[PDB]
C-alpha cells in the first residue's frame, strides 16, 4: 500500500535514475557533440555512479536494470562488458558495415541511442529510458548547437514515442478523476486504442516487448520474458494483437485502473518508411555463434546480463563458481552483470589499475559462470533485434504441424511455448524459419521510452520530466491525422493536462 515509507523510497530510487540519466547524457555530449567514450565504458561508469549515490541514503537495495544502450536495431539487451570488446571485433570482423556502432563502441551520426536503466530499494523500483539521437556539429556557429534536424523514419519513431508517452501519462492521470476525460472509465481497450492509432498515424508499429502494467514490491516486470506470474494486470502489443487488428494470459477487459497504485510505461516503436507492404514486426535473438550462417547482416555477440531462478539448486564442483553464486544470491532477484559483483567496482577513485583489477576478476567470473550456466541456475537475458516479415511468405508458408511445434532445445521454455499468432497455427520456431527463409531480411530501427508513475489528488511521475527526456528537435512528417474521435480526445487531453496535476520528481545535483 502507498505509505509514506513506500512513496519516499520510490522517490529516492527514481531521482537517482534521473541524475544518472543526466550523467550519461552529459558524458555523451562531452564525448561526441563537444570538441571519446565507448558504450561499455559508459555503462559501468553509470552503474558505479548509481551505487555511489545509493550508498549515501540507506537492506535489499541496488540496480534493477543494468544500464542498456541499444543502437538503431536492438529492441533490448545490449549492455556489454569490457571483456568483450576485442571478441566483438574478431567475431564480426568479416561482417558488413551495419551494427558498426554496437560492434566498435564508437557511436556514429544519425545513430538512434536508446538508453534505459532502473534502481530499486527494498523491492520498490523505478525504471526509465530515453531515445536520444546523434546529429553532427556546427563549426562556424559560436555556440555550436549541432547541425541538422532528423528526417526519415527514425524521426517518426521518436515522435510516436514522445507523444504516446505524454498521452498515456495524461490518461493515467485522469484515472484519478471520473471526469476531465473526453468521452471520445479507463481500460486497456482505450489505452491500446489510442496508442495503436498514434502508431498508425506515424507509420511506426508497436514492438512485441512493449507494455504498460502494474507494479508491486519486488514484482515490476524487469524480466517479463523469463519468469512467470498469475496476477499480472496490464497491456501488451504482440503478434497476436497484430493479427487480430488485421482481422477486425494478460486479459484486457477486466482491467480498470484505480487510485493508490504504481505503474510502468514502456513503449517501443519500429519505423516503416520502406518495407513497401503490410508485414509483421517480431524479434530475433543474437547468439555468439559465427558458424550457424554465412550472411553478413547478422550480429554476433554475448549478452552480459543474467538472472537466477532461485527455485533451483545444484552443488557446483568449482570453488570459483560457488563463491560467485554466494555473491549472486547475496544480491537480489533483479538482473546483474559480472562487473557489479566485485571488489573495486564502484570506483571510489578511478584509474587504469582498478579497471585492470576488475578485468582479472572478470576472467575468473566467466569461468564460474560457465559451470553456473551449464547447470540451469542462471540464464541470459537475450539480445533481441526487431525484424520485419511480409505476410506473403507467412501465408504461402507450409507448417505440417501447427500448435504442436515446440522448439525443444530452447533453454527457457517460456519463449518456447509461446504460440505468438494462434490463428494460422504458426509458432515462433517456424516464424524464425520464415524470417530467415527470405531475401527480404529487413530489420527495422526502433525508438524506446520508459517511465514510472504512481497514482495517489495528482499523478506523481517518478521519472521523465523535461530535464530528463527533452526530445532532440527533429523534422518528421505524418504528424497526427486530425478528423477523428480519438485524435480530438488526445488533443483535449493534452490541453487539459495543463491545468490535471502532474507532479514530477527532479534529479539530484
Amino acid at each position: 500500500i502507498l505509505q509514506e515509507s513506500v512513496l519516499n523510497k520510490y522517490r529516492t530510487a527514481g531521482q537517482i535514475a534521473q541524475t544518472a540519466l543526466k550523467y550519461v547524457t552529459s558524458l555523451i555530449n562531452d564525448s561526441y557533440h563537444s570538441k571519446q567514450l565507448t558504450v561499455p565504458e559508459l555503462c559501468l561508469l553509470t552503474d558505479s555512479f548509481i551505487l555511489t549515490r545509493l550508498e549515501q541514503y540507506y537492506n535489499e537495495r541496488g540496480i534493477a536494470i543494468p544500464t542498456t544502450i541499444d543502437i538503431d536495431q536492438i529492441s533490448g539487451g545490449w549492455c556489454p562488458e569490457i571483456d568483450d570488446t576485442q571478441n566483438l571485433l574478431n567475431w564480426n570482423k568479416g561482417k558488413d558495415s551495419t551494427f558498426a556502432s554496437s560492434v566498435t563502441g564508437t557511436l556514429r551520426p544519425g545513430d538512434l541511442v536508446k538508453i534505459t536503466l532502473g534502481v530499486h530499494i527494498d523491492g520498490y523500483t523505478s525504471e526509465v529510458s530515453h531515445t536520444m539521437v546523434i546529429y553532427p556539429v556546427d563549426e562556424t556557429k559560436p555556440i555550436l548547437q549541432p547541425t541538422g534536424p532528423l528526417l526519415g523514419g527514425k524521426a517518426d519513431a521518436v515522435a510516436a514515442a514522445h507523444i504516446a508517452m505524454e498521452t498515456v501519462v495524461a490518461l493515467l492521470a485522469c484515472a484519478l478523476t471520473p471526469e476531465k476525460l473526453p468521452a471520445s472509465g479507463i481500460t486497456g481497450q482505450l489505452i491500446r486504442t489510442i496508442v495503436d492509432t498514434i502508431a498508425r498515424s506515424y507509420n511506426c508499429g508497436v514492438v512485441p516487448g512493449s507494455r504498460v502494467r502494474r507494479i508491486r514490491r519486488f514484482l515490476a516486470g524487469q524480466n517479463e520474458g523469463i519468469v512467470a506470474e498469475r496476477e499480472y494486470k496490464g497491456v501488451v502489443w504482440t503478434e497476436s494483437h497484430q493479427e487480430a487488428d488485421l482481422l477486425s494470459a494478460i486479459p484486457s477487459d477486466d482491467f480498470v485502473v484505480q487510485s493508490g497504485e504504481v505503474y510502468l510505461i514502456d513503449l517501443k516503436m519500429a519505423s516503416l518508411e520502406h518495407c513497401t507492404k503490410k508485414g509483421l514486426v517480431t524479434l530475433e535473438t543474437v547468439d555468439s555463434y559465427t558458424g550457424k550462417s554465412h550472411k553478413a547482416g547478422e550480429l554476433i555477440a554475448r549478452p552480459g546480463a543474467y538472472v537466477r531462478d532461485f527455485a533451483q539448486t545444484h552443488i557446483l564442483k568449482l570453488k570459483t563458481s560457488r563463491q560467485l553464486l554466494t555473491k549472486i544470491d547475496k544480491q537480489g532477484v533483479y538482473p546483474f552483470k559480472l562487473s557489479h559483483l566485485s571488489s573495486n567496482f564502484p570506483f571510489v577513485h578511478e584509474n587504469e589499475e582498478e579497471l585492470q583489477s576488475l578485468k582479472k576478476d572478470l576472467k575468473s567470473f566467466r569461468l564460474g559462470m560457465s559451470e553456473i550456466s551449464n547447470n540451469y541456475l542462471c540464464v541470459e537475458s537475450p539480445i533481441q533485434i526487431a525484424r520485419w516479415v511480409p505476410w506473403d511468405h507467412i501465408l504461402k508458408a507450409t507448417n505440417p504441424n501447427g500448435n504442436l511445434s515446440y522448439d525443444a532445445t530452447s533453454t527457457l521454455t517460456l519463449p518456447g511455448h509461446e504460440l505468438p499468432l494462434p490463428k494460422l497455427g504458426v509458432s515462433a520456431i517456424k516464424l524464425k524459419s520464415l524470417m530467415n527463409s527470405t531475401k527480404e531480411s529487413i530489420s527495422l530501427p526502433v525508438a524506446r521510452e520508459c517511465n514510472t508513475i504512481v497514482l495517489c489528488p495528482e499523478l506523481l511521475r517518478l521519472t521523465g520530466g523535461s530535464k530528463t527526456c527533452q526530445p532532440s528537435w527533429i523534422h518528421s512528417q505524418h504528424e497526427l491525422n486530425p478528423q477523428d474521435s480519438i485524435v480530438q480526445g488526445i488533443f483535449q487531453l493534452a490541453t487539459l493536462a495543463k491545468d490535471l496535476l502532474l507532479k514530477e520528481t527532479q534529479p539530484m545535483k
Partner: peptide, 16 residues
C-alpha cells in the same frame, strides 16, 4: 476449413 476462411479474409485485407 477455418484456416481456409481466415486466410481468405487475410488475403482480402492485405491485397487492399
Amino acid at each position: 476449413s477455418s484456416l481456409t476462411l481466415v486466410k481468405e479474409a487475410l488475403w482480402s485485407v492485405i491485397d487492399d
